[PDB]
């Protein structure tokens, strides 16, 4: 069931891209008639982030957590998940923008809340929330997807330290996050506020995060562009009030981008909060 022969894994075509590695969409056929089932296969061209990734992954098991279906050996592994045809949100809500309405929007909301819920009893910070790490499995039901960044915080402890030179996803992040390196469940909070105003845009890309804040911070080197961010939040300025977004759900959204990680509400009030409003 979790071990797939490298020999099997049939591709078909590709399904995400990046400068290090690769997600691949591949039938598993073992019978060779072509009656397989359909899987999403993550591989690489780093070699012990995808194994830290794929152990966090193997341990998770939630309705709105995309399902672990196994592995693929060589010192090169690949990750065997279930493939959610409609893609990320960053892909679908582009291309839905007429079949998506408020209350569409309002269930996704409620499923990844419930999907980072899970998570933080598991005692894991995401660290890499966003709407193209959220795969639609259906139009009523999301998936969370990307465990690269994921971190396990100790017991007792409220936070992770990040020691290390990986890239992030700043654009997404908590000034704790940003100034101290410190990533606590209220991290991951701030970044689901980020992901809600994406989908609340329906991932218009002039309306993205980096777009809205690099319009806000104005000509940055590289190098000062998180010390410019970090100056931007700490002034009070946020990602506006999507137009078409009611008050009650922009409230929901200010909750997730109150400065300090104490003054931030959970993922179990912001699900009370949007089932109120369905
Ligand atoms: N299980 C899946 N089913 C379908 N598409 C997927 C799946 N996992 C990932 N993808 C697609 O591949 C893209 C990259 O995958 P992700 O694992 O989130 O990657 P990374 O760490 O490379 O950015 C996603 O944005 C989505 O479009
Ligand atoms: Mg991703």
Same mark, same amino acid.
């Given at each position: 069931?979790?071990?797939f /022969? ?5 591709? =078909?075509? *590709?399904?995400?891209?990046g ?8 039938? %598993? ?14 591989s ?5 982030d ?6 966090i ?21 690949k ?12 892909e679908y ?6 079949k ?36 639609? /499995? ?5 998936? =969370?997807? *990307?465990?690269g960044?994921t971190?396990?915080?100790?017991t007792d402890?409220?936070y %992770?330290?990040?020691k ?5 996803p ?14 606590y ?9 980020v992901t ?5 845009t329906?991932c218009?890309?002039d309306?993205?995060?980096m ?5 806000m911070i ?6 000062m562009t998180?010390?410019?961010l ?7 300025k ?7 977004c ?16 104490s ?9 009370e ?6």
């Amino acid at each position: 069931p979790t071990h797939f /022969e490298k020999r099997f894994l049939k591709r =078909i075509r *590709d399904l995400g891209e990046g400068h290090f590695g690769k997600v691949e969409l591949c039938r %598993y056929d073992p019978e060779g008639d072509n009656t397989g089932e359909q899987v999403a296969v993550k591989s690489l061209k780093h070699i012990a982030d995808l194994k830290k990734e794929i152990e966090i992954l193997r341990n998770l098991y939630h309705e709105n957590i995309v399902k672990y279906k196994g592995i693929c050996t060589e010192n090169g592994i690949k990750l065997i998940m279930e493939f959610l045809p409609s893609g990320s949100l960053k892909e679908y809500l582009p291309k839905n923008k007429n079949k998506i309405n408020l209350k569409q929007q309002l269930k996704y909301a409620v499923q990844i809340c419930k999907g980072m819920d899970y998570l933080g009893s598991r005692q894991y910070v995401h660290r890499d929330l966003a709407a193209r790490n959220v795969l639609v /499995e259906s139009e009523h039901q999301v998936k =969370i997807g *990307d465990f690269g960044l994921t971190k396990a915080i100790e017991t007792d402890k409220e936070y %992770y330290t990040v020691k290390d030179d990986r890239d992030s996803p700043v654009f997404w992040y908590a000034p704790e996050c940003l100034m101290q390196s410190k990533f606590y469940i209220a991290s991951d909070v701030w970044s689901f506020g980020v992901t809600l105003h994406e989908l609340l845009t329906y991932c218009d890309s002039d309306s993205s995060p980096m777009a809205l804040f690099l319009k806000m911070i104005g000509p940055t080197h590289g190098q000062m562009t998180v010390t410019r961010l970090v100056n931007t939040l700490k002034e009070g300025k946020r990602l506006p009030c999507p137009p078409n977004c009611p008050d009650e759900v922009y409230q929901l959204m200010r909750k997730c981008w109150e400065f300090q990680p104490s003054n931030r509400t959970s993922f179990q009030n912001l699900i009370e909060g949007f089932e109120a409003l369905l």
